[PDB]
Design an enzyme around this catalytic site. Structure first.
Site, PDB file in Angstrom:
ATOM      1  N   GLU A   1       0.827  -1.231   0.000  1.00  0.00           N
ATOM      2  CA  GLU A   1       0.000   0.000   0.000  1.00  0.00           C
ATOM      3  C   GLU A   1       0.849   1.263   0.000  1.00  0.00           C
ATOM      4  OE1 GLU A   1      -3.078   0.310  -0.541  1.00  0.00           O
ATOM      5  OE2 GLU A   1      -3.825  -1.733  -0.298  1.00  0.00           O
TER       6      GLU A   1
ATOM      7  N   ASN B   1      -7.758  10.091  -5.507  1.00  0.00           N
ATOM      8  CA  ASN B   1      -8.485   9.319  -6.456  1.00  0.00           C
ATOM      9  C   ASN B   1      -9.331  10.204  -7.340  1.00  0.00           C
ATOM     10  OD1 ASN B   1      -8.424   7.346  -3.851  1.00  0.00           O
ATOM     11  ND2 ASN B   1      -7.847   6.540  -5.819  1.00  0.00           N
TER      12      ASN B   1
ATOM     13  N   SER C   1     -12.051  11.304  -3.451  1.00  0.00           N
ATOM     14  CA  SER C   1     -11.501  10.752  -2.225  1.00  0.00           C
ATOM     15  C   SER C   1      -9.984  10.708  -2.274  1.00  0.00           C
ATOM     16  CB  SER C   1     -12.061   9.353  -1.935  1.00  0.00           C
ATOM     17  OG  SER C   1     -11.594   8.420  -2.845  1.00  0.00           O
TER      18      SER C   1
ATOM     19  N   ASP D   1      -6.592   8.447  -0.317  1.00  0.00           N
ATOM     20  CA  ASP D   1      -6.071   7.381   0.538  1.00  0.00           C
ATOM     21  C   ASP D   1      -4.907   7.932   1.357  1.00  0.00           C
ATOM     22  OD1 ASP D   1      -7.756   5.392  -0.719  1.00  0.00           O
ATOM     23  OD2 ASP D   1      -6.423   5.434  -2.377  1.00  0.00           O
TER      24      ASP D   1
ATOM     25  N   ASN E   1      -9.114   5.187   2.983  1.00  0.00           N
ATOM     26  CA  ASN E   1      -9.826   6.110   2.100  1.00  0.00           C
ATOM     27  C   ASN E   1     -10.804   7.011   2.816  1.00  0.00           C
ATOM     28  OD1 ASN E   1     -12.249   6.548  -0.043  1.00  0.00           O
ATOM     29  ND2 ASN E   1     -10.280   6.469  -1.090  1.00  0.00           N
TER      30      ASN E   1
END
Ligand code: NA
Length: 129
Positions: free
Chosen positions: A35, A46, A50, A52, A59
């Protein structure tokens, strides 16, 4: 902060992740590797508006408040900045909620793509905690 592999395993263990909901410590370490490359400051915007955040790329659509994400919920009851701290407490507590929300660790796309079904114990080889 970029954690070392076994350094992160130790912190995760102290925070009660080993075998949390049946997921071994190697699964958690593997998830963080793919990740965020163990980087607590990792972020990813994103296309849907949103973001992360942090070592586990949690998220904002659902889990934290960044003040700019649509829906939107804050199921971990934290500002998303808490997920960017050098200390992993907020990320761990939030991950425990996520992994309990009905998809297990499949909520982490990099875990699905690089960890799931692999020999994940390798991620704690040499740690001997
Ligand atoms: Na892939």
């Amino acid at each position: 902060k970029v954690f070392g592999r076994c350094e992160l395993a130790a912190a995760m263990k102290r925070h009660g992740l080993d075998n949390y909901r049946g997921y071994s410590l190697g699964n958690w370490v593997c998830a963080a590797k793919f990740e965020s490359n163990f980087n607590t400051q990792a972020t990813n915007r994103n296309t849907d508006g949103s973001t992360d955040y942090g070592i586990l790329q949690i998220n904002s659509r659902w889990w934290c408040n960044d003040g700019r994400t649509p829906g939107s919920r804050n199921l971990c009851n934290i500002p998303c900045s808490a997920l960017l701290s050098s200390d992993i407490t907020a990320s761990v507590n939030c991950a425990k909620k996520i992994v309990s929300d009905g998809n297990g660790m499949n909520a982490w796309v990099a875990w699905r793509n690089r960890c799931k079904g692999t020999d994940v114990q390798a991620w704690i080889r040499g740690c001997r905690l």
